[PDB]
């Protein structure tokens, strides 16, 4: 059961419960909104762009949420950004992972903190503080420098 | 736990860097360098300077 105009705009109902059962609203250029009753799905397809503009946007799911792109993903905000998890929080990249702040950077973690790398460089400008319970440094050739002279171990 | 793992380099740049370990702080790896202008190592009462 359908309703069509002369340009090709369509609103269609399909009653075949053994396949192709649902509602469709589309045009000939390739914009589709499909309500699928056999599978209980909703599909929205646009050849170029899909825009969601409102005052608030809420996504509620009882399982996974997946976002996939062939290019960048951007998130620009004029206030805070918050991310909370009850498990792990993975930040994995194949080239680099850079974190720049115009103010402080705070890494506060109860229990353990681990850092592993080929080379580690710490570059201070005013002071470098290493306060702890027990301090131990290793290495096959450890050198303590500063000002005129130096100590070689 | 918190893990910062890299396979090429790790570079930290900041005005002040402060590390406060409640129990233990350990540094490992060959060719360790500590530099600056004034370097102090303390303990119970010992205090040496460079």
């Amino acid at each position: 059961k359908s309703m069509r105009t002369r340009s090709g705009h369509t609103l269609e109902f399909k009653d075949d419960e053994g396949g192709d059962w649902g509602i469709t609203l589309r045009d000939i250029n390739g914009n589709v909104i499909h309500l699928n009753s056999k599978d209980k799905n909703i599909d929205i397809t646009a050849p170029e762009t899909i825009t969601l503009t409102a005052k608030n946007v809420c996504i509620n799911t009882e399982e996974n949420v997946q976002i996939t792109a062939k290019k960048n993903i951007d998130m620009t905000v004029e206030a805070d950004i918050n991310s909370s998890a009850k498990g792990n929080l993975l930040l994995q990249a194949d080239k680099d992972v850079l974190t720049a702040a115009k103010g402080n950077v705070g890494i506060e973690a109860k229990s353990d903190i681990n850092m592993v790398g080929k080379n580690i460089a710490v570059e201070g400008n005013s002071k470098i503080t290493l306060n702890g319970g027990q301090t131990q440094v290793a290495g096959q050739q450890t050198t303590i420098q500063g000002a005129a002279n130096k100590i070689e171990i | 736990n918190v893990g910062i793992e890299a396979k090429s380099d790790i570079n930290m740049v900041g005005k002040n860097i402060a590390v406060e370990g409640n129990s233990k702080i350990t540094l490992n790896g060959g060719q360790t360098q500590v530099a600056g202008q004034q370097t102090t190592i303390q303990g119970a009462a010992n205090k040496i300077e460079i």
Binding site: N149, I151 | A45, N46, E49, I50
Partner: peptide, 5 residues
């Protein structure tokens, strides 16, 4: 130089 405790 090296000012010990």
């Amino acid at each position: 130089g090296v000012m010990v405790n």
